[PDB]
Design a protein around this ligand. Structure first.
Ligand SMILES: CCCCCCCC
Lengths: 337, 20
């Protein structure tokens, strides 16, 4: 039943992957309202589409800045993948286009804010609350990895909460379709698996390590490896030692020991039984995976909604101009966008 | 406490991605 779902999901994906949509709107069709964030690179702006009155979250990248940061291939990855995927816990790409200066990805607006905000304010989530979110990530990675995709930037900053209280994963700036191994140093310090830090070839197991970090951070209120500077975080990550709060359940600690496992032949997600080692673990015994997928499970909380276009679940950011040069920049580099 | 150490740290806000 899972296999049959994923077979169909793959044929759907490959059709779009081999024939990507391009140039499906224009900037002048949107009214810019307010900046919602910054992601891996660029910024995200709340916009309103005039013809429908729908609100969207439009990611904007400056082509010249992308080139300087050596993110050309990663950016083409992001858009090609986003336009091809389809899953309940992935933010949907509605439109993409480019102009002389910038690249634009118009996504669904998810008004509940980043998990990050909610987590820092509350301090920590309960184990049942953490498990509800974690389950959604397990299913999302099951989907993505089946398509030979690695996500590579799991963190609370990238997990938006919808009006049903379910997660949508945003920002695919380091996502890559790769069979076998890859080598790019990318991600966020706290979430990096040891094999990335140590410049080894790595695979989708890095995402399962990152899940460990996330579940820990959600249930503890702080990450398993933290310091004032990245180098000190890396020394902690490669040490082989983790400490759990005394309030963590024995089932939670066992899951985490198997996710935050430096040894790849023992890391959950990466053994012969795949994602089933995680889905069948005792910590998830109360989890009804299909009801999670169907959004039939009652969420831990529902974000406050003040109206269409409300951004009060998001921090305020300095507003910057969307400048469009009269000369085309970087045309060849971004021709497929 | 570990929580106090975290809250006093410089990495309790939104964290940026790295690259080389
Ligand atoms: C019968 C529907 C199963 C859904 C499982 C989703 C796997 C990623």
């Amino acid at each position: 039943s899972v296999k049959e779902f994923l077979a169909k999901a793959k044929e759907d994906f490959l059709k779009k992957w081999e024939n990507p949509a391009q140039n499906t709107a224009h900037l002048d069709q949107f009214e810019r309202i307010k900046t919602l964030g910054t992601g891996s690179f660029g910024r995200v702006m709340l916009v309103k589409h005039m013809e429908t009155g729908n609100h969207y979250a439009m990611k904007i990248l400056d082509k010249q800045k992308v080139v300087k940061l050596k993110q050309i291939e990663h950016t083409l990855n992001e858009k090609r993948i986003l336009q091809a995927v389809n899953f309940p816990f992935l933010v949907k790409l509605e439109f993409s286009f480019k102009d002389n200066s910038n690249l634009y990805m118009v996504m669904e607006y998810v008004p509940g804010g980043e998990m990050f905000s909610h987590l820092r304010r509350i301090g920590r989530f309960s184990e049942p609350h953490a498990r509800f979110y974690a389950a959604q990530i397990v299913l999302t990675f099951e989907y993505l990895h089946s398509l030979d995709l690695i996500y590579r930037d799991l963190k609370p900053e990238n997990l938006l909460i919808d009006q049903q209280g379910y997660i949508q994963v945003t920002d695919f700036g380091f996502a890559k379709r790769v069979k076998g191994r890859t080598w790019t140093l990318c991600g966020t310090p706290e979430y990096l698996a040891p094999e990335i830090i140590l410049s080894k070839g790595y695979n989708k197991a890095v995402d399962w390590w990152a899940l460990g970090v996330l579940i820990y951070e959600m249930a503890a209120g702080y990450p398993p490896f933290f310091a004032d500077q990245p180098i000190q975080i890396y020394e902690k990550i490669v040490s082989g030692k983790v400490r759990f709060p005394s309030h963590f359940s024995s089932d939670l600690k066992d899951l985490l020991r198997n996710l935050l496992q430096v040894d790849l032949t023992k890391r959950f997600g990466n053994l012969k039984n795949g994602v089933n080692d995680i889905k069948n673990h005792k910590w998830f015994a109360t989890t009804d995976w299909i009801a999670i997928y169907q959004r039939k499970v009652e969420a831990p909380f529902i974000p406050k909604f003040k109206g269409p276009g409300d951004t009060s679940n998001f921090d305020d950011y300095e507003e910057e101009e969307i400048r469009v040069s009269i000369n085309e920049k970087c045309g060849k580099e971004f021709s497929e966008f | 406490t570990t929580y106090a150490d975290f809250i006093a740290s410089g990495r309790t806000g939104r964290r940026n991605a790295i690259h080389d």
